[PDB]
Amino acid sequence: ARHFVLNTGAKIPSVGLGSWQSDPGVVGNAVYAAVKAGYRHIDCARVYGNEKEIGLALKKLFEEGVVKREDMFITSKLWNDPEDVPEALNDSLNDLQLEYLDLYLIHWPFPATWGAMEKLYDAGKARAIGVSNFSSKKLGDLLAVARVPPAVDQVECHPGWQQTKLHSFCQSTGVHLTAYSPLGSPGTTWMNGNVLKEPIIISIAEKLGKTSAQVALRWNIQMGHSVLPKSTNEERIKQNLDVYDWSIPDDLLAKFSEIKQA
């Protein structure tokens, strides 16, 4: 399928457009292009300050009949350095011109803050709630005390930073792992490199007639994780969604275990 099923029963499309901050219009143009190309999952974050621009792109898509709201999966998030959680969600919804989010994520120094998230879930303002950047240990601690378990833990995960421990823990507990920076970042790559240049990935890409980035994304999807590639290039945006009608054979998948980790 082109989705995973969360512990709430909702479907999360396995490819979404990741979030970042750019110059005026760049992110909105990417959102528009991505949805027109077939993306049904857009990741956002209030820290980037650009939710109003994303909301304008989504409003254009809906008014043009590209997609209905119900067909989209829209995530946003808050990072706290509890009373401000519903105000922040309230503000994200206003900027995005939405009545609900499919997913709302939080990070905090970890619990009353999760209790606030649970209230918003119960109210339907966030159809699923989860966390950002929680290790196995912190996710387990939260699971031990929460009434509503997190649906998602969104973390950096790519072939050079495979999150093997968290991956297994999410499998055992039913929390879904969404991979941000799925095409790598220098700070989580061996010797500050580029994981798309790893010879194992290039070799597999060459065998299958795919780009290195397509291979990296398909690996994460085969591991059971959704992915949030970022690109402003329409050809790459298209390639990055073309990760469903083929697979990495098991013998080649096994080679990912040899990629040096940061």
Question: What CATH number does residue 205 fall under?
Answer: 3.20.20.100
Q: To one decimal place, what's the resolution in Å?
A: 1.5
* Helix (H), strand (E) at residue 233: none
107 is known to lie in a ligand binding site: yes
48 as an active site residue: the answer is: yes
Q: In what order do the strands lie in the sheet containing 41-43?
A: 41-43, 73-79, 103-107, 129-132, 152-156, 176-180, 226-227
Q: Residue 66 belongs to what domain range?
A: 1-262
Identify the DSSP state of 40. -
Number of domains in the chain: 1
List 106's β-bridge partners, or say none: 78, 131
Distance, in Å, from the CA atom of 163 to the CA atom of 227, rounded to the nearest integer, reads: 14
Residue 148 corresponds to which amino acid? V
Selecting among 32, 39, 48, 180, the annotated active-site residue is: 48
Rg from Cα positions in the chain: 18
Distance, in Å, from the CA atom of 221 to the CA atom of 199, rounded to the nearest integer, reads: 20
Q: Which region, left, alpha or beta, applies to residue 171 given φ > 0 means left and ψ of -120 to 50 means alpha?
A: alpha
Q: How was this structure determined?
A: X-ray
The SS3 call for residue 134 is coil
SS3 content of the chain, % helix, strand, coil (to 5): 45, 15, 35
- Return the biggest CA–CA distance within the chain: 53
Distance, in Å, from the CA atom of 124 to the CA atom of 62, rounded to the nearest integer, reads: 21
Distance, in Å, from the CA atom of 32 to the CA atom of 246, rounded to the nearest integer, reads: 26
Distance, in Å, from the CA atom of 106 to the CA atom of 119, rounded to the nearest integer, reads: 14
